[PDB]
Design a protein around this nucleic acid. Sequence first.
RNA 1: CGCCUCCUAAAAGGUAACGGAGGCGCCCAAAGGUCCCCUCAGGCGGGACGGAAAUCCGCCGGAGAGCGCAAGGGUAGAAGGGGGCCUGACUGCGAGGCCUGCAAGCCGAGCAGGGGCGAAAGCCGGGCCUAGUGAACCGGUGGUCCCGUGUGGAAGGGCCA
RNA 2: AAUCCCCCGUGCCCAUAGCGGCGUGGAACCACCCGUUCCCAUUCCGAACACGGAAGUGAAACGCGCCAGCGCCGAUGGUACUGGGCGGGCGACCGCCUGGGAGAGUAGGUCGGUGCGGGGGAU
Lengths: 182, 110, 49, 136
Amino acid sequence: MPLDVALKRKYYEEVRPELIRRFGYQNVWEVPRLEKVVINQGLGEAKEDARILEKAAQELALITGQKPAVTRAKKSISNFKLRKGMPIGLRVTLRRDRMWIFLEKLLNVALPRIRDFRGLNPNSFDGRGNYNLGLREQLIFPEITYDMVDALRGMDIAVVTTAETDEEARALLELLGFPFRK
Amino acid sequence: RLTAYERRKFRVRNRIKRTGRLRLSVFRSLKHIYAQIIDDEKGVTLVSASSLALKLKGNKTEVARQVGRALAEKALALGIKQVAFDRGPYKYHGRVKALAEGAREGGLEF
Amino acid sequence: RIKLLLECTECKRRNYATEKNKRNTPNKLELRKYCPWCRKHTVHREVKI
Amino acid sequence: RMKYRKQQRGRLKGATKGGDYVAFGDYGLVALEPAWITAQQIEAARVAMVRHFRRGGKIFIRIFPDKPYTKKPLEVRMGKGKGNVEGYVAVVKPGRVMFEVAGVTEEQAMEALRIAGHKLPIKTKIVRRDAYDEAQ
RNA sequence: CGCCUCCUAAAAGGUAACGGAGGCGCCCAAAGGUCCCCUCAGGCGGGACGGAAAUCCGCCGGAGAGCGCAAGGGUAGAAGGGGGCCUGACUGCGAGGCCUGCAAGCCGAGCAGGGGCGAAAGCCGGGCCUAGUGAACCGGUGGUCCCGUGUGGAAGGGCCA
RNA sequence: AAUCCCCCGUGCCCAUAGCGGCGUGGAACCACCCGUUCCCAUUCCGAACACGGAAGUGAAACGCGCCAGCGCCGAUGGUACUGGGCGGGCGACCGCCUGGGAGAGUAGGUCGGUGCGGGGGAU
């Protein structure tokens, strides 16, 4: 555990200067590093309120620190254009290091893990070189067992990077955490 | 744009309406910091706080409290006798709480 | 008569001040505050139906 | 006519001058001493032209079915909310740039207009492109 | 057939019409105080349960989203979005003005007692404002403790709320 | 002490103080920066705010200068309008005399000018 902690620490610390000058030649800047990572998941309407809301709890929890209560369908998805406020903001905006043992554990230690979990995804982030890819099925047992039949699945996170333009960002998490195929 | 700039222009305009005659403009950060006194944009500006006469960049929000109390008396007499308040890029607990107490003695005079 | 009914404040037997008010949401709950001419200001209380 | 999906019920009345002039193809019909002109009458001309022109190569446009004219009642005595919507049309008054093409190549177009408007409803004149026009 | 808003009042203001249009005769116990923070819709690009439209990431933007309620004014230099603590949505009152012939209705610095939001420079005598309104009589109730038809009291009654 | 100059602030002027394009500075500014027990802080993270300091860099916020593409400014003329007096027409309406006389429309215009405190920049 703190094992893979020291791990990401190194992966990146070195890889960084590595490609850093390999191609950069700017001034070893965020050319192209990664900072803070928010994570978001399958909106409250995915609710049952008490039940799967508390499950969202368990999960958000053991995953990175924060676990769901009972309120996930207000101003309701209702019928099509039928919705009011937005009291279903269930996400983790944790900011740094924790995040890195995470890049670790998460990408590099749980990446392929369950049903054909391959990863042959085109322009992963591409929306400015900052993230993109959230997976559509939990890291199954990134911990816990049957603590809810359907429990959870709509999973998707995002990193705040500086890997500016893509090709660059690409160098970045490509060698840093694995670039899923063509 | 309008965002952070406003953080600014807001403490601004409110501060401004405020009117008990003068305001000192503290300024957060290390060597950055320094506070100058002003009144009505008559055009004038009383005295200048602390020329970077470093006393302890250390764990010294006290580098602060000091430069402050300093400016406190500095103006205190610098400009004979008066009463008002000031700006602040933030709440009064750190750097700024500091310039505060500085001023604080500035007026307290004991 | 609607969820809008009129009450008024009176204070610890030492005065009564007035003002209308409502019925809706927290209904009865009626302490409040106010100050009578009793003493110089004073709690008052409010309630009084 | 066409003054579809309006927005209000009625206008009012006045008249005096405006801003029609240019060219837009070189087959032009310009009003001169009018006011409002029935969206219909209008279509009239439209027809006249369209038909004359060996019945095909398109003409263009000009004014619009603009306002809602009301004779209100039907013939009553007067005091209705002045309500009633009824005849819709153009509001062109100082010799206006009325623009109609086709590819007549000639006094043929001429005729087309000739009747169209001779018809329509006023003292008016016609021509082509006479002093270009420069915009930004 | 009372009131608010817009047009026509034609540029001060201000005016009919069986002239155009269109709302209100609620409340909001906390949209009432103040201190501290924040800051739109929508466009685009990238994304779990999506999947025209949530939720999150990445840019873009005289602010056209917003403010119970209609319009209009305003206006995110927020009146707007969030947190803390609290009653002044105080009594005594006001100088001096808006409009108005009547009565109306309406604007208010500042002095007093008295508190509440900051440490304070100060804001708070309801709300973001322009409609939610009704003389006079009559009578009720909570006072008060002024009057009483010889005097003591009292039916009853004067001013307050 | 009291000259201009570099500025860090902090003031009047509402877009020629804008967008954006090329450049460029840290010596000293100042920014990001380091880390967090301690002030005090994020309904998640000191992200911001904050505390706690050598460094490293000047990427990022950042200040001038060149660039007018968008945007902003937007005259001279010129017409419409019309204050007032008179005509011409049954007419809707036209026209004449005497002062005021925007708009848009080529000009061409700009990539701020400056109030004050001051580290200080040049015996």
